[PDB]
Amino acid sequence: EGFAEEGAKAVYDRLKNDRQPYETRAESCAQYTIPSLFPKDSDNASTDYTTPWQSVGARGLNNLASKLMLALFPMQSWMKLTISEYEAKNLLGDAEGLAKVDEGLSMVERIIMNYIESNSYRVTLFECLKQLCVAGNALLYLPEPEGYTPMKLYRLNSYVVQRDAFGNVLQIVTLDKIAFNALPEDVRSQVEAAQGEQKEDAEIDVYTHVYLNEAGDGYSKYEEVAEEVVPGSEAEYPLEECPYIPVRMVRIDGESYGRSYVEEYLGDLKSLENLQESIVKMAMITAKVIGLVDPAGITQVRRLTAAQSGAFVPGRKQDIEFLQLEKSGDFTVAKNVSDTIEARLSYAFMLNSVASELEDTLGGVYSILSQELQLPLVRVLLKQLQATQQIPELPKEAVEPTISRGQDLDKLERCIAAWSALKALEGDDDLNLANLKLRIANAIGLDTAGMLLTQEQKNALMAQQGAQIATQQGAAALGQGMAAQATASPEAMAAAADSVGMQPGM
Amino acid sequence: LSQELQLPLVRVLLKQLQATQQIPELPKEAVEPTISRGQDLDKLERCIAAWSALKALEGDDDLNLANLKLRIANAIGLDTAGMLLTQEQKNALMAQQGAQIATQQGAAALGQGMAAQATASPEAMAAAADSVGMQPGM
Amino acid sequence: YLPEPEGYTPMKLYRLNSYVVQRDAFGNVLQIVTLDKIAFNALPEDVRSQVEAAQGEQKEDAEIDVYTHVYLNEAGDGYSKYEEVAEEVVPGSEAEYPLEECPYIPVRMVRIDGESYGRSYVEEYLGDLKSLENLQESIVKMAMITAKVIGLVDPAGITQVRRLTAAQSGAFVPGRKQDIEFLQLEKSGDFTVAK
């Protein structure tokens, strides 16, 4: 237990120091965009989050999280299952053998989507994305499938991770605070024999420590409650499929954590906050009404306040003056710079002022997240569903690209239109139509495996068509033949009615 | 970047996938240009449209349509290898088309012939019902 | 660098301050060296034992520098690759690659002959970025000056500002408008020129 000699709690306390710069930077980012997202670990229920003086941070952060969610996890099939084409062709035969396999792979994808949707993963995905944008570090843990099981998201100030300078993960420790009654019975008794008698709703710190095991590649997981491991939680996970996946956006090499997206534009938010602050303060000065009456004048204001709706009272207009705020020229200067900072911050998020300029910028934001978040989540789910017999046992040769189907539909539709154009050239004896169809498919990029009719398959279509013609023509000839025979001669008409059970004459 | 990045990445992948049997062993005569498919689709679609316009001239005995089709392909730039039907390949098309007509017309005559023979005469109707296991009269 | 295919294998990207390359004026690559810092436990056992017998006892999470050297071999065309950890080669990493197929491909944009490295695309426009940085900074600085509000009242006047601040939302107080003036930033003509 080289990574676990001291214990799960000791590692969490030691590594907490390295997490401090990221926590502090996350609180600053949240203070300007949305204060409620990242409280500073000292805020209890009796803390009010004052709205930032500018609304660009909140509007931009919500928009970016939604746009990322829509692109990363669209309505259907953001992943696919692909088998090695060269290997599959050798093991199988040809024609529909590959097509049949693709049904099995496609069926597995639909089960993955159903499992994700039925367990409300999209709720946790959207919460993770908001945390990633403002904090940039989030930990999501996928528990073993058992009925309705939604995965849990760990905020930055709930877990700790140590990474190498190479970039690989060495150990992960998370903190949970479960009440005494909510703990499992064996764990509940263990605490009773460690810290004496505990209250019914007493918070108990629970640590789980996932660390890179020695020698063979993998991960070792255990849980400790008071100071010692629970009677059993020891779990072995390989690198590819580990339930605890620490996701970070904007990753800098040599760092154990990622950097938030708002941090890049935090300074512009600070300047906008200050400029927007002074503008409103000027308006409240403007709100107050002060009447400056000249002491050297003759007008007595006691007559004005005591006057009725319309009245004639002694006085002069020049005596009464109203103090109004100057700096009209200053006001325009502040708005112009404030407008400029808002305009550039609007483009930084996915906010319109353009249509063909924000997707391309968006394309680079979630490129890291596909490998960091999408791919590990599918790998863990596939193993978990295989264990619980939710999906058939995969042959281990299937690879998972996260696409945001794909070109399969477009290539089929493109060659179909091209083939339809080649339909107008039929009846031509000079041109080799069959070769042109093969050339078109190669140009489009289809596999051309089984799309052509072999000689045996040509005969099968002829036999099926021939039986249809024989039945269609045979039924007509048989139908009218019996009716002609039945109605021929009145005697046979009586016999025909006798066969069906009727009596001649009514 | 096409020469600096795209080309070396493909070259390393081609060798690495052959070693792990991910792709069939290349004959070492294959060269890869990185295009940013290609003109092959455009040449085929353009050549088809020209032939479709030439299809309006079919039935003309003055003009050599077969020569013009070859000239059109040369102007577009296709390889013109295998697009023309050889005399042996023309025979296969007639043989396949002829077999369809024989089967299509044979099935109609056979189906109508069998039904007519079965339904002729009341006693042959009963014999036909006996063959399929049915009983005359309900 | 493209590693050998083994299941799911993603290629590694080396930043500029992680590797080093030597090229000739002809442009051909002579040698490439990469530096990696892997923790002691993450290293393979054969390498891990070698470090144990080289630098003594090592901490579990101690970063270990690993150098991979790819150089143009003598005589025949090719590249020779080996890895050394402390000061000597590992038990085995000797790999030979042809010129066309080498996993370590140093990609550069805007290449200048006689140089071992490329030049970035931003360098061609860094001067404009610096010039725009200074102008944009000063424009924001002026707005913050404008953000502050100061009331300049004439000491020779009769208006007492103690009455204005102590008044309510509506009030009649002695004073004159001419006494109270507000300092506002000038240079409206400058602001357009800088903008």
PDB file of N, CA, C and O in Angstrom, chain C residues 11-64:
ATOM      1  N   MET C  11      -2.010   9.329 -29.065  1.00  0.00           N
ATOM      2  CA  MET C  11      -0.676   9.871 -29.260  1.00  0.00           C
ATOM      3  C   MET C  11      -0.421  11.022 -28.296  1.00  0.00           C
ATOM      4  O   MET C  11      -1.347  11.696 -27.839  1.00  0.00           O
ATOM      5  N   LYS C  12       0.850  11.233 -27.974  1.00  0.00           N
ATOM      6  CA  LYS C  12       1.246  12.250 -27.013  1.00  0.00           C
ATOM      7  C   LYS C  12       1.760  13.492 -27.727  1.00  0.00           C
ATOM      8  O   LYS C  12       2.459  13.395 -28.738  1.00  0.00           O
ATOM      9  N   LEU C  13       1.410  14.655 -27.189  1.00  0.00           N
ATOM     10  CA  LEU C  13       1.878  15.940 -27.685  1.00  0.00           C
ATOM     11  C   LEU C  13       2.937  16.486 -26.740  1.00  0.00           C
ATOM     12  O   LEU C  13       2.715  16.553 -25.527  1.00  0.00           O
ATOM     13  N   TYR C  14       4.079  16.875 -27.293  1.00  0.00           N
ATOM     14  CA  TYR C  14       5.151  17.487 -26.524  1.00  0.00           C
ATOM     15  C   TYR C  14       5.173  18.983 -26.797  1.00  0.00           C
ATOM     16  O   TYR C  14       5.247  19.405 -27.954  1.00  0.00           O
ATOM     17  N   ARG C  15       5.109  19.779 -25.735  1.00  0.00           N
ATOM     18  CA  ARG C  15       5.216  21.218 -25.890  1.00  0.00           C
ATOM     19  C   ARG C  15       6.657  21.598 -26.217  1.00  0.00           C
ATOM     20  O   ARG C  15       7.570  20.769 -26.186  1.00  0.00           O
ATOM     21  N   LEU C  16       6.858  22.876 -26.546  1.00  0.00           N
ATOM     22  CA  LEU C  16       8.187  23.327 -26.943  1.00  0.00           C
ATOM     23  C   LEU C  16       9.195  23.140 -25.817  1.00  0.00           C
ATOM     24  O   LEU C  16      10.322  22.695 -26.054  1.00  0.00           O
ATOM     25  N   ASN C  17       8.812  23.463 -24.586  1.00  0.00           N
ATOM     26  CA  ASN C  17       9.722  23.279 -23.458  1.00  0.00           C
ATOM     27  C   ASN C  17       9.576  21.901 -22.822  1.00  0.00           C
ATOM     28  O   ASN C  17       9.532  21.739 -21.605  1.00  0.00           O
ATOM     29  N   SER C  18       9.553  20.882 -23.677  1.00  0.00           N
ATOM     30  CA  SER C  18       9.586  19.492 -23.240  1.00  0.00           C
ATOM     31  C   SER C  18      10.508  18.620 -24.071  1.00  0.00           C
ATOM     32  O   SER C  18      10.855  17.523 -23.620  1.00  0.00           O
ATOM     33  N   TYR C  19      10.912  19.052 -25.261  1.00  0.00           N
ATOM     34  CA  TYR C  19      11.776  18.283 -26.139  1.00  0.00           C
ATOM     35  C   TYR C  19      12.786  19.229 -26.771  1.00  0.00           C
ATOM     36  O   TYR C  19      12.756  20.442 -26.550  1.00  0.00           O
ATOM     37  N   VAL C  20      13.691  18.665 -27.568  1.00  0.00           N
ATOM     38  CA  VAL C  20      14.688  19.454 -28.276  1.00  0.00           C
ATOM     39  C   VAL C  20      15.030  18.733 -29.573  1.00  0.00           C
ATOM     40  O   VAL C  20      15.038  17.501 -29.636  1.00  0.00           O
ATOM     41  N   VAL C  21      15.286  19.512 -30.622  1.00  0.00           N
ATOM     42  CA  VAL C  21      15.557  18.970 -31.948  1.00  0.00           C
ATOM     43  C   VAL C  21      16.713  19.742 -32.570  1.00  0.00           C
ATOM     44  O   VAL C  21      16.866  20.949 -32.359  1.00  0.00           O
ATOM     45  N   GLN C  22      17.545  19.029 -33.325  1.00  0.00           N
ATOM     46  CA  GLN C  22      18.665  19.623 -34.043  1.00  0.00           C
ATOM     47  C   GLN C  22      18.511  19.324 -35.525  1.00  0.00           C
ATOM     48  O   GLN C  22      18.421  18.157 -35.921  1.00  0.00           O
ATOM     49  N   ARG C  23      18.488  20.374 -36.338  1.00  0.00           N
ATOM     50  CA  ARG C  23      18.381  20.257 -37.781  1.00  0.00           C
ATOM     51  C   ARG C  23      19.603  20.882 -38.434  1.00  0.00           C
ATOM     52  O   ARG C  23      20.324  21.672 -37.817  1.00  0.00           O
ATOM     53  N   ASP C  24      19.833  20.518 -39.688  1.00  0.00           N
ATOM     54  CA  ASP C  24      20.904  21.108 -40.469  1.00  0.00           C
ATOM     55  C   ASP C  24      20.369  22.284 -41.284  1.00  0.00           C
ATOM     56  O   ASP C  24      19.164  22.541 -41.338  1.00  0.00           O
ATOM     57  N   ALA C  25      21.284  23.015 -41.924  1.00  0.00           N
ATOM     58  CA  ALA C  25      20.868  24.037 -42.876  1.00  0.00           C
ATOM     59  C   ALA C  25      20.155  23.419 -44.068  1.00  0.00           C
ATOM     60  O   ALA C  25      19.314  24.069 -44.695  1.00  0.00           O
ATOM     61  N   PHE C  26      20.478  22.166 -44.393  1.00  0.00           N
ATOM     62  CA  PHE C  26      19.762  21.454 -45.442  1.00  0.00           C
ATOM     63  C   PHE C  26      18.323  21.152 -45.048  1.00  0.00           C
ATOM     64  O   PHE C  26      17.490  20.917 -45.929  1.00  0.00           O
ATOM     65  N   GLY C  27      18.015  21.150 -43.754  1.00  0.00           N
ATOM     66  CA  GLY C  27      16.673  20.917 -43.271  1.00  0.00           C
ATOM     67  C   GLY C  27      16.423  19.537 -42.705  1.00  0.00           C
ATOM     68  O   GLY C  27      15.393  19.336 -42.051  1.00  0.00           O
ATOM     69  N   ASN C  28      17.323  18.585 -42.928  1.00  0.00           N
ATOM     70  CA  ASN C  28      17.123  17.242 -42.406  1.00  0.00           C
ATOM     71  C   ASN C  28      17.376  17.206 -40.902  1.00  0.00           C
ATOM     72  O   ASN C  28      18.177  17.973 -40.363  1.00  0.00           O
ATOM     73  N   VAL C  29      16.680  16.299 -40.227  1.00  0.00           N
ATOM     74  CA  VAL C  29      16.730  16.196 -38.775  1.00  0.00           C
ATOM     75  C   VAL C  29      17.881  15.285 -38.379  1.00  0.00           C
ATOM     76  O   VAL C  29      18.007  14.167 -38.894  1.00  0.00           O
ATOM     77  N   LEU C  30      18.723  15.758 -37.462  1.00  0.00           N
ATOM     78  CA  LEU C  30      19.840  14.959 -36.974  1.00  0.00           C
ATOM     79  C   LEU C  30      19.469  14.150 -35.736  1.00  0.00           C
ATOM     80  O   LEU C  30      19.637  12.928 -35.721  1.00  0.00           O
ATOM     81  N   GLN C  31      18.970  14.809 -34.693  1.00  0.00           N
ATOM     82  CA  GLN C  31      18.643  14.114 -33.459  1.00  0.00           C
ATOM     83  C   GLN C  31      17.489  14.813 -32.757  1.00  0.00           C
ATOM     84  O   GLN C  31      17.299  16.023 -32.893  1.00  0.00           O
ATOM     85  N   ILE C  32      16.720  14.030 -32.003  1.00  0.00           N
ATOM     86  CA  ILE C  32      15.589  14.516 -31.223  1.00  0.00           C
ATOM     87  C   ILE C  32      15.684  13.922 -29.827  1.00  0.00           C
ATOM     88  O   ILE C  32      15.915  12.716 -29.678  1.00  0.00           O
ATOM     89  N   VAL C  33      15.510  14.759 -28.809  1.00  0.00           N
ATOM     90  CA  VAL C  33      15.519  14.326 -27.417  1.00  0.00           C
ATOM     91  C   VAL C  33      14.235  14.807 -26.761  1.00  0.00           C
ATOM     92  O   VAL C  33      13.854  15.971 -26.920  1.00  0.00           O
ATOM     93  N   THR C  34      13.572  13.918 -26.029  1.00  0.00           N
ATOM     94  CA  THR C  34      12.361  14.256 -25.297  1.00  0.00           C
ATOM     95  C   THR C  34      12.577  14.001 -23.814  1.00  0.00           C
ATOM     96  O   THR C  34      13.288  13.072 -23.424  1.00  0.00           O
ATOM     97  N   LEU C  35      11.952  14.832 -22.986  1.00  0.00           N
ATOM     98  CA  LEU C  35      12.071  14.739 -21.539  1.00  0.00           C
ATOM     99  C   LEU C  35      10.700  14.489 -20.930  1.00  0.00           C
ATOM    100  O   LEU C  35       9.748  15.223 -21.210  1.00  0.00           O
ATOM    101  N   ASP C  36      10.608  13.458 -20.096  1.00  0.00           N
ATOM    102  CA  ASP C  36       9.382  13.112 -19.397  1.00  0.00           C
ATOM    103  C   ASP C  36       9.672  12.970 -17.911  1.00  0.00           C
ATOM    104  O   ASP C  36      10.758  12.539 -17.514  1.00  0.00           O
ATOM    105  N   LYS C  37       8.691  13.332 -17.091  1.00  0.00           N
ATOM    106  CA  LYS C  37       8.797  13.243 -15.638  1.00  0.00           C
ATOM    107  C   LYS C  37       7.693  12.314 -15.144  1.00  0.00           C
ATOM    108  O   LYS C  37       6.551  12.736 -14.943  1.00  0.00           O
ATOM    109  N   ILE C  38       8.040  11.047 -14.947  1.00  0.00           N
ATOM    110  CA  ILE C  38       7.105  10.027 -14.489  1.00  0.00           C
ATOM    111  C   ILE C  38       7.387   9.733 -13.025  1.00  0.00           C
ATOM    112  O   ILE C  38       8.550   9.651 -12.611  1.00  0.00           O
ATOM    113  N   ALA C  39       6.327   9.582 -12.236  1.00  0.00           N
ATOM    114  CA  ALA C  39       6.491   9.220 -10.840  1.00  0.00           C
ATOM    115  C   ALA C  39       7.098   7.827 -10.720  1.00  0.00           C
ATOM    116  O   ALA C  39       7.093   7.031 -11.662  1.00  0.00           O
ATOM    117  N   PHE C  40       7.630   7.540  -9.532  1.00  0.00           N
ATOM    118  CA  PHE C  40       8.339   6.283  -9.322  1.00  0.00           C
ATOM    119  C   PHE C  40       7.417   5.082  -9.495  1.00  0.00           C
ATOM    120  O   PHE C  40       7.794   4.092 -10.130  1.00  0.00           O
ATOM    121  N   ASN C  41       6.202   5.151  -8.948  1.00  0.00           N
ATOM    122  CA  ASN C  41       5.296   4.010  -9.038  1.00  0.00           C
ATOM    123  C   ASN C  41       4.780   3.811 -10.456  1.00  0.00           C
ATOM    124  O   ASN C  41       4.567   2.673 -10.889  1.00  0.00           O
ATOM    125  N   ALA C  42       4.567   4.901 -11.195  1.00  0.00           N
ATOM    126  CA  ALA C  42       4.031   4.787 -12.545  1.00  0.00           C
ATOM    127  C   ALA C  42       5.025   4.190 -13.530  1.00  0.00           C
ATOM    128  O   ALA C  42       4.620   3.791 -14.626  1.00  0.00           O
ATOM    129  N   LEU C  43       6.303   4.120 -13.173  1.00  0.00           N
ATOM    130  CA  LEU C  43       7.296   3.528 -14.052  1.00  0.00           C
ATOM    131  C   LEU C  43       7.138   2.008 -14.088  1.00  0.00           C
ATOM    132  O   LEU C  43       6.625   1.406 -13.142  1.00  0.00           O
ATOM    133  N   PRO C  44       7.563   1.366 -15.174  1.00  0.00           N
ATOM    134  CA  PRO C  44       7.565  -0.100 -15.208  1.00  0.00           C
ATOM    135  C   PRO C  44       8.563  -0.677 -14.216  1.00  0.00           C
ATOM    136  O   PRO C  44       9.507  -0.014 -13.781  1.00  0.00           O
ATOM    137  N   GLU C  45       8.331  -1.943 -13.857  1.00  0.00           N
ATOM    138  CA  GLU C  45       9.110  -2.575 -12.794  1.00  0.00           C
ATOM    139  C   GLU C  45      10.592  -2.650 -13.139  1.00  0.00           C
ATOM    140  O   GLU C  45      11.446  -2.395 -12.283  1.00  0.00           O
ATOM    141  N   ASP C  46      10.920  -3.015 -14.380  1.00  0.00           N
ATOM    142  CA  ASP C  46      12.325  -3.120 -14.761  1.00  0.00           C
ATOM    143  C   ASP C  46      13.025  -1.771 -14.662  1.00  0.00           C
ATOM    144  O   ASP C  46      14.167  -1.689 -14.194  1.00  0.00           O
ATOM    145  N   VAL C  47      12.358  -0.702 -15.096  1.00  0.00           N
ATOM    146  CA  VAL C  47      12.910   0.638 -14.919  1.00  0.00           C
ATOM    147  C   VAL C  47      12.904   1.025 -13.446  1.00  0.00           C
ATOM    148  O   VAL C  47      13.844   1.658 -12.952  1.00  0.00           O
ATOM    149  N   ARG C  48      11.849   0.648 -12.720  1.00  0.00           N
ATOM    150  CA  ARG C  48      11.743   1.018 -11.313  1.00  0.00           C
ATOM    151  C   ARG C  48      12.873   0.408 -10.493  1.00  0.00           C
ATOM    152  O   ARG C  48      13.441   1.070  -9.617  1.00  0.00           O
ATOM    153  N   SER C  49      13.212  -0.855 -10.761  1.00  0.00           N
ATOM    154  CA  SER C  49      14.325  -1.484 -10.059  1.00  0.00           C
ATOM    155  C   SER C  49      15.655  -0.841 -10.424  1.00  0.00           C
ATOM    156  O   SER C  49      16.547  -0.738  -9.575  1.00  0.00           O
ATOM    157  N   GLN C  50      15.809  -0.413 -11.679  1.00  0.00           N
ATOM    158  CA  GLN C  50      17.049   0.233 -12.097  1.00  0.00           C
ATOM    159  C   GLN C  50      17.275   1.537 -11.344  1.00  0.00           C
ATOM    160  O   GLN C  50      18.398   1.828 -10.917  1.00  0.00           O
ATOM    161  N   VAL C  51      16.221   2.338 -11.174  1.00  0.00           N
ATOM    162  CA  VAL C  51      16.348   3.574 -10.411  1.00  0.00           C
ATOM    163  C   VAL C  51      16.641   3.272  -8.949  1.00  0.00           C
ATOM    164  O   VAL C  51      17.368   4.021  -8.285  1.00  0.00           O
ATOM    165  N   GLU C  52      16.084   2.178  -8.424  1.00  0.00           N
ATOM    166  CA  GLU C  52      16.348   1.795  -7.040  1.00  0.00           C
ATOM    167  C   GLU C  52      17.832   1.539  -6.815  1.00  0.00           C
ATOM    168  O   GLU C  52      18.390   1.938  -5.786  1.00  0.00           O
ATOM    169  N   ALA C  53      18.487   0.881  -7.767  1.00  0.00           N
ATOM    170  CA  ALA C  53      19.904   0.566  -7.666  1.00  0.00           C
ATOM    171  C   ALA C  53      20.800   1.671  -8.206  1.00  0.00           C
ATOM    172  O   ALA C  53      22.024   1.506  -8.216  1.00  0.00           O
ATOM    173  N   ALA C  54      20.227   2.787  -8.655  1.00  0.00           N
ATOM    174  CA  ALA C  54      20.998   3.904  -9.183  1.00  0.00           C
ATOM    175  C   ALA C  54      20.974   5.120  -8.270  1.00  0.00           C
ATOM    176  O   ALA C  54      22.027   5.689  -7.970  1.00  0.00           O
ATOM    177  N   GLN C  55      19.791   5.537  -7.815  1.00  0.00           N
ATOM    178  CA  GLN C  55      19.654   6.685  -6.928  1.00  0.00           C
ATOM    179  C   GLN C  55      19.189   6.286  -5.531  1.00  0.00           C
ATOM    180  O   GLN C  55      18.687   7.130  -4.784  1.00  0.00           O
ATOM    181  N   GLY C  56      19.353   5.016  -5.164  1.00  0.00           N
ATOM    182  CA  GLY C  56      18.949   4.576  -3.844  1.00  0.00           C
ATOM    183  C   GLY C  56      17.439   4.484  -3.703  1.00  0.00           C
ATOM    184  O   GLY C  56      16.702   4.285  -4.674  1.00  0.00           O
ATOM    185  N   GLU C  57      16.975   4.631  -2.465  1.00  0.00           N
ATOM    186  CA  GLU C  57      15.549   4.571  -2.173  1.00  0.00           C
ATOM    187  C   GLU C  57      14.852   5.810  -2.719  1.00  0.00           C
ATOM    188  O   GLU C  57      15.329   6.934  -2.535  1.00  0.00           O
ATOM    189  N   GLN C  58      13.722   5.604  -3.390  1.00  0.00           N
ATOM    190  CA  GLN C  58      12.974   6.681  -4.018  1.00  0.00           C
ATOM    191  C   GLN C  58      11.571   6.767  -3.436  1.00  0.00           C
ATOM    192  O   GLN C  58      10.954   5.751  -3.102  1.00  0.00           O
ATOM    193  N   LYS C  59      11.074   7.996  -3.322  1.00  0.00           N
ATOM    194  CA  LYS C  59       9.729   8.231  -2.827  1.00  0.00           C
ATOM    195  C   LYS C  59       8.700   7.684  -3.812  1.00  0.00           C
ATOM    196  O   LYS C  59       8.962   7.533  -5.007  1.00  0.00           O
ATOM    197  N   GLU C  60       7.510   7.378  -3.287  1.00  0.00           N
ATOM    198  CA  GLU C  60       6.473   6.757  -4.104  1.00  0.00           C
ATOM    199  C   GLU C  60       6.050   7.661  -5.255  1.00  0.00           C
ATOM    200  O   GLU C  60       5.855   7.193  -6.382  1.00  0.00           O
ATOM    201  N   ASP C  61       5.902   8.960  -4.994  1.00  0.00           N
ATOM    202  CA  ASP C  61       5.458   9.914  -6.001  1.00  0.00           C
ATOM    203  C   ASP C  61       6.588  10.808  -6.502  1.00  0.00           C
ATOM    204  O   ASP C  61       6.327  11.902  -7.010  1.00  0.00           O
ATOM    205  N   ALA C  62       7.835  10.367  -6.365  1.00  0.00           N
ATOM    206  CA  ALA C  62       8.965  11.180  -6.794  1.00  0.00           C
ATOM    207  C   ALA C  62       9.049  11.216  -8.313  1.00  0.00           C
ATOM    208  O   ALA C  62       9.014  10.173  -8.971  1.00  0.00           O
ATOM    209  N   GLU C  63       9.158  12.420  -8.869  1.00  0.00           N
ATOM    210  CA  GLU C  63       9.273  12.570 -10.313  1.00  0.00           C
ATOM    211  C   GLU C  63      10.639  12.090 -10.783  1.00  0.00           C
ATOM    212  O   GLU C  63      11.670  12.471 -10.220  1.00  0.00           O
ATOM    213  N   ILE C  64      10.645  11.260 -11.820  1.00  0.00           N
ATOM    214  CA  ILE C  64      11.868  10.694 -12.376  1.00  0.00           C
ATOM    215  C   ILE C  64      11.985  11.160 -13.818  1.00  0.00           C
ATOM    216  O   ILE C  64      11.060  10.965 -14.616  1.00  0.00           O
TER     217      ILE C  64
END
